[PDB]
RNA sequence: AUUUGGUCAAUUUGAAUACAGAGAUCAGCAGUUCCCCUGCAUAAGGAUGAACCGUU
C-alpha cells in the first residue's frame, strides 16, 4: 500500500539547457564575390557623388 | 529618232537672303574583371620557443 503497485509513473524528463551556438553561416565563393562587387560598387558611387 | 532619271537645304516671304550647314586633334589618370607578389586584419588550423619552484 505505501508504495502502490497499481500506478505507472511518467516523471518529468529534465531538458538540458543546450547552449544556442549561432551557426557560422558560410558563403559560396560566388556569393562572396557578389557581395564584394556590390559594396565596393556602392562605395565608388558614393565617392563619385561626393566628388561630383 | 525625241525624252525622265538633274528641285540645295535653312531663314525672311506675302521672290529675296542666305550658299551646303556648323568642335577638332594629341595626352594622362582612375575605375571594371582576372592573375601574381607583398604587409595588415579577421576567422579557423597547425608548428615551435623560452630558468624554476609555485598556490591554500
Swiss-Prot record:
It comes from the Eukaryota. It is found in: Nucleus. Component of the U4/U6-U5 tri-snRNP complex composed of the U4, U6 and U5 snRNAs and at least PRP3, PRP4, PRP6, PRP8, PRP18, PRP31, PRP38, SNU13, SNU23, SNU66, SNU114, SPP381, SMB1, SMD1, SMD2, SMD3, SMX2, SMX3, LSM2, LSM3, LSM4, LSM5, LSM6, LSM7, LSM8, BRR2 and DIB1. Present with 432 molecules/cell in log phase SD medium. Participates in pre-mRNA splicing. Part of the U4/U5/U6 tri-snRNP complex, one of the building blocks of the spliceosome. This is U4/U6 small nuclear ribonucleoprotein PRP3. It comes from Saccharomyces cerevisiae (strain ATCC 204508 / S288c). The chain holds residues 210 to 261 of 469 of the full protein.
Amino acid at each position: 500500500e505505501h508504495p502502490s503497485i497499481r500506478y505507472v509513473a511518467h516523471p518529468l524528463p529534465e531538458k538540458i539547457n543546450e547552449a544556442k551556438v549561432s551557426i557560422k553561416a558560410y558563403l559560396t565563393q560566388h556569393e562572396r564575390k557578389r557581395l564584394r562587387r556590390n559594396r565596393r560598387k556602392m562605395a565608388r558611387e558614393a565617392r563619385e557623388i561626393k566628388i561630383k
